[PDB]
Amino acid sequence: VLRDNIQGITKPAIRRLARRGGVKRISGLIYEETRGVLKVFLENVIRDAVTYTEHAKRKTVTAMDVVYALKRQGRTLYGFGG
Amino acid sequence: VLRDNIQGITKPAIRRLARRGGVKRISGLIYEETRGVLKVFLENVIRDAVTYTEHAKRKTVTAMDVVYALKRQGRTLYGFGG
Amino acid sequence: HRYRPGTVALREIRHYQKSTELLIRKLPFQRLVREIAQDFKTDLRFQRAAIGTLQEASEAYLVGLFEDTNLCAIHATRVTIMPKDIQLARHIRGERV
Amino acid sequence: HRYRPGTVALREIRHYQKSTELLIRKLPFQRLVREIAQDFKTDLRFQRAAIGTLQEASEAYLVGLFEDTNLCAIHATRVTIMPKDIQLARHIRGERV
Amino acid sequence: RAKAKTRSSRAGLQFPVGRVHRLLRKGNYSERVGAGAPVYLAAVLEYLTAEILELAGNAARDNKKTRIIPRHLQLAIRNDEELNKLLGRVTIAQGGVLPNIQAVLLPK
Amino acid sequence: RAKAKTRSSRAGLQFPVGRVHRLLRKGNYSERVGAGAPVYLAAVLEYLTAEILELAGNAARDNKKTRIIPRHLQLAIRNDEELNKLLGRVTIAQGGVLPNIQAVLLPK
Amino acid sequence: RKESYSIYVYKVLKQVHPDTGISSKAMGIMNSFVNDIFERIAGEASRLAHYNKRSTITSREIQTAVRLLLPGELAKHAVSEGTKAVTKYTSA
Amino acid sequence: RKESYSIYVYKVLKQVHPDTGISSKAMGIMNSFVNDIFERIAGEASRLAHYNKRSTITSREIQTAVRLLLPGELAKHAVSEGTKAVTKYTSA
DNA sequence: ATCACAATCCCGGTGCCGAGGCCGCTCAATTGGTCGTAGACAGCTCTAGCACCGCTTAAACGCACGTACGGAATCCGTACGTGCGTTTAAGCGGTGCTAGAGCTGTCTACGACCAATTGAGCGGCCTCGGCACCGGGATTGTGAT
DNA sequence: ATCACAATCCCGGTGCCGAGGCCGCTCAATTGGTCGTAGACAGCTCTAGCACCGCTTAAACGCACGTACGGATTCCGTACGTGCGTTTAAGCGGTGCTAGAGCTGTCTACGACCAATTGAGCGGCCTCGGCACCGGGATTGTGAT
Structure with missing residues (x-):
């Protein structure tokens, strides 16, 4: 049973993500708030993807399930990741 | 030929709309900006509505053309404005 | 005797958030809609309910925009909405800016 | 000798906006995804491409959110982003808040 | 030949199963439509309708009124978190808005 | 029988008219599909593809590159107004972002 | 008609x-709501059928589409209602 | 396959x-783009046929969907290309 | 703290038009029989997901230090809100005219369907060349002076 | 303006693995013919959109005036950014094991289709009941006194 993996989203990673966003100075309370925002986004996408997987009677979440779930959220993605 | 009807959207009408939105104090330059925003929104909706009308070989814009054009913008409307 | 600045504004806020009627006058809005539509097609006719639906949607859109703008103005520690507040609210919403 | 505060930040901004690689480490993100998914169904399997796709989408979402948050912080005449900036950006976008 | 019985009455529903089946069949949704799909869809639509009407009637009764008007529907939707999430991109004609004044604008 | 000709070559296209017709027929879009609709659709799809590949090839050449990578597609889409409007809600995998630093954050 | x-x-x-x-204005609102929810559920069920290369929309597709479209408590109660109605209909 | x-x-x-x-990754992006535009245009054309009580999707519906979906000059050039292709096809 | 008096809630009392009930009919829903195939299920292969482990070394972390920034307080000047008299034009009701929406009937061209033919594309293998990286060297961007 | 030096750009010089070409064949696209019906087109009726006008009165407009707010300035305390030595764990590559994804074949229950029956829903007509309005009175809420 995995637990408390949200701390694997480290402060340096959040700083890199903010730098790609153009941020110059980051308050100390941003990291926990970002962790919450990311958790909510992932919960909604993963719930939809698992629904798509269970409808197909599969046990394995495929990339296409994730792509369809992102299309539900209005987050259309072109291509794939690794 | 109609000309310069955007000024028919008067300063007190914009003030009433801001009051329904909970705005307490309004800058003097807000009225022209609001007119520009309304003109852009109306242009998009009306262009789509007229496209729907033309596809039907009609000369009259119906309320259902407007409801489809609003549904295209992602602005679903229940009922009719009358 | 006269009311301090903002008392009448707060009364107006309570009154207009209580009500549901249209806040723009019907003839000027109809003239505006026809003037816009004449650019896409000449000699266009309109059902009355079409113009009514357009006004309902437009007023709802403007009221929602003013709510977001008021949030932006409060975020700047002002109480006056300014054009930059509208610009910020429309940019974040993804609108044509 | 020592760089003034902000010079290294501006260099980093230039570097990370030039590049396209993933900014979150893969193993921690995959553990996070599996931990979140166990609450919906036990003993799920994942294609590797599935987790990769999730990471790409998540990082894009966070970068867009940070851009909007930066706009809000600048609107408040600040150069430091704060939790209230994120709250305002997410509220204007229409998110759950 | 037995006396005709509606599929709504067999399923114990007020919403019309036959009309839902005809709409599903003619909507270019799929090549074939299963027997239970219109029944399930009608049950779901009826339940959502009942949920909204209950909240709107509560609002109307709170306003000392016996008729539901679009303002009552708007109040019911915007005050229920689930319905507000479902109908969040929807404009109700003549619905108005929820009374809400920001605390910073209030006096003294 | 005459020598077979693909409908794409009759219409002077590189995109496949026959496959577009087959996708239209099997996609539950309508009961019948006219003869000119797949031709028109293939033409439009080819035009949009050509626009994007032209812009992306220009972006690749500006970096002294021979092969188009996802970054060049992202730069082409975000730097062109109409494409940016059409693809507004789309994420390009490994596209990155446009370089953009707000002026107030720059020194002096 | x-x-x-x-x-x-x-x-x-x-x-x-x-x-x-x-x-009658509120009854028009209700009609619009019923039609909008119908179109949402039917379209999501059609997409579910096309994704899995199926040709029939069954109660399984409707249940999945409802789980996809309805949030939280609403989805669970609507699923309960749909299952109950289908069970009562099958026993008729 | x-x-x-x-x-x-x-x-x-x-x-x-x-x-x-x-x-190949840019090619995958391009495949996704073509598939997305196809879905958008075909869905709008299906809506246009349904609104006008027509059972057939013709080049008129495709053209109207193109005008509804594509912005500005993209729509003008796409309509021109489609019309030219259909004209060339009809004379074949 | 008080008061005038303005905004607001109570309590009834006629109007008045829209809700909701009622009835005949027609057209969509139901029932029963036949049949073709979609899909449920079983069985099998072999792909790819998971677990674990040891090494390397890049990233993360914790701490010290200093200064740049956020926040608070002050001040001023002018652009807002409020009130009042005058002007404007919206709203309403009525009249008249006609464009075009909606429907119906006819017919014919177009699209489905089917059987045979064939060539376009797909998967698999193979090979060179575009680009990533490294190292040496010249330029410039940044901080103290 | 000078100076140090870290960061950045520039110019080859390879390796390597993936972009792109080649080929056999199979399965999807094409050709030709027959048939039914979708819809193009004409013609007709009658609705509803547009034009216009006169009155009334609510709304808009212009102006005066004052003060509340926005913006600039200053000051300070600490929360941030930067640098560096140490610890952590990610990434990689290899191995083993097996769950389950993807496929194929069988067969049967289910859903389409069609003809006949029939009753539910809809349109029009009608009559009262809910609700907005009005006036007289009490409540309460704001700003100077």
């Missing part, structure tokens, strides 16, 4: 609040 | 940039 859900919405109203009427 | 647009995208690429290649 236009088609509306007005009589069925009125029947549901008489069960839920027996003494309460409804205005 | 999955079907994609890589061979036609490559042909168009060699038509516009003879000396330019493309990586």
Whole structure:
């Protein structure tokens, strides 16, 4: 049973993500708030993807399930990741 | 030929709309900006509505053309404005 | 005797958030809609309910925009909405800016 | 000798906006995804491409959110982003808040 | 030949199963439509309708009124978190808005 | 029988008219599909593809590159107004972002 | 000869609040709501059928589409209602 | 044996940039783009046929969907290209 | 703290038009029989997901230090809100005219369907060349002076 | 303006693995013919959209005036950014094991289709009941006194 993996989203990673966003100075309370925002986004996408997987009677979440779930959220993605 | 009807959207009408939105104090330059925003929104909706009308070989814009054009913008409307 | 600045504004806020009627006058809005539509097609006719639906949607859109703008103005520690507040609210919403 | 505060930040901004690689480490993100998914169904399997796709989408979402948050912080005449900036950006976008 | 019985009455529903089946069949949704799909869809639509009407009637009764008007529907939707999430991109004609004044604008 | 000709070559296209017709027929879009609709659709799809590949090839050449990578597609889409409007809600995998630093954050 | 859900919405109203009427503007709102939810559920079920290369829309597709479209408590109660109605219909 | 647009995208690429290649990930992006635009146009055309009580999707519906979906000059050039292709096809 | 008096809630009392009930009919829903195939299920292969482990070394972390920034307080000047008299034009009701929406009937061209033919594209293998990286060297961007 | 030096750009010089070409064949696209019906087109009726006008009165407009707010300035305390030595764990590559994804074949229950029956829903007509309005009175809420 995995637990408390949200701390694997480290402060340096959040700083890199903010730098790609153009941020110059980051308050100390941003990291926990970002962790919450990311958790909510992932919960909604993963719930939809698992629904798509269970409808197909599969046990394995495929990339296409994730792509369809992102299309539900209005987050259309072109291509794939690794 | 109609000309310069955007000024028919008067300063007190914009003030009433801001009051329904909970705005307490309004800058003097807000009225022209609001007119520009309304003109852009109306242009998009009306262009789509007229496209729907033309596809039907009609000369009259119906309320259902407007409801489809609003549904295209992602602005679903229940009922009719009358 | 006269009311301090903002008392009448707060009364107006309570009154207009209580009500549901249209806040723009019907003839000027109809003239505006026809003037816009004449650019896409000449000699266009309109059902009355079409113009009514357009006004309902437009007023709802403007009221929602003013709510977001008021949030932006409060975020700047002002109480006056300014054009930059509208610009910020429309940019974040993804609108044509 | 020592760089003034902000010079290294501006260099980093230039570097990370030039590049396209993933900014979150893969193993921690995959553990996070599996931990979140166990609450919906036990003993799920994942294609590797599935987790990769999730990471790409998540990082894009966070970068867009940070851009909007930066706009809000600048609107408040600040150069430091704060939790209230994120709250305002997410509220204007229409998110759950 | 037995006396005709509606599929709504067999399923114990007020919403019309036959009309839902005809709409599903003619909507270019799929090549074939299963027997239970219109029944399930009608049950779901009826339940959502009942949920909204209950909240709107509560609002109307709170306003000392016996008729539901679009303002009552708007109040019911915007005050229920689930319905507000479902109908969040929807404009109700003549619905108005929820009374809400920001605390910073209030006096003294 | 005459020598077979693909409908794409009759219409002077590189995109496949026959496959577009087959996708239209099997996609539950309508009961019948006219003869000119797949031709028109293939033409439009080819035009949009050509626009994007032209812009992306220009972006690749500006970096002294021979092969188009996802970054060049992202730069082409975000730097062109109409494409940016059409693809507004789309994420390009490994596209990155446009370089953009707000002026107030720059020194002096 | 236009088609509306007005009589069925009125029947549901008489069960839920027996003494309460409804205005014709509010009945139009209700008709729009019913039609919008119908189109959402049917389109999501059609996408579910096409994704899995199936040709039939069954109660399974409807259940999955409802789980995809309805949030939280609403989805669970609607699924309960749909299952109950299908079970009662099958025993008829 | 999955079907994609890589061979036609490559042909168009060699038509516009003879000396330019493309990586497989950019090609996957292009395939996703073509599939997305196809879904959008076909869905809008199906809506247009349904609104007007027509059972057939013709080039008129495709053209109207193109005008509804594409912005500005893209729509004008796409309509021109489609009309030219249909005209050439009809004379064949 | 008080008061005038303005905004607001109570309590009834006629109107008045829209809700909701009622009835005949027609057209969509239901029932029963036949049949073709979609899909449910079983069985099998072999792909790819998971677990674990040891090494390397890049990233993360914790701490010290200093200064740049956020926040608070002050001040001023002018652009807002409020009130009042005058002007404007919206709203309403009525009249008249006609464009075009909606419907119906006819017919014919177009699209489905089917059987045979064939060539386009797909998967698999193979090979060179575009680009990533490294190292040496010249330029410039940044901080103290 | 000078100076140090870290960061950045520039110019080859390879390796390597993936972009792109080649080929056999199979399965999807094409050709030709027959048939039914979708819809193009004409013609007709009658609705509803547009034009216009005169009155009334609510709304808009212009102006005066004052003060509340926005913006600039200053000051300070600490929360941030930067640098560096140490610890952590990610990434990689290899191995083993097996769950389950993807496929194929069988067969049967289910859903389409069609003809006949029939009753639910809809349109029009009608009559009262809910609700907005009005006036007289009490409540309460704001700003100077």
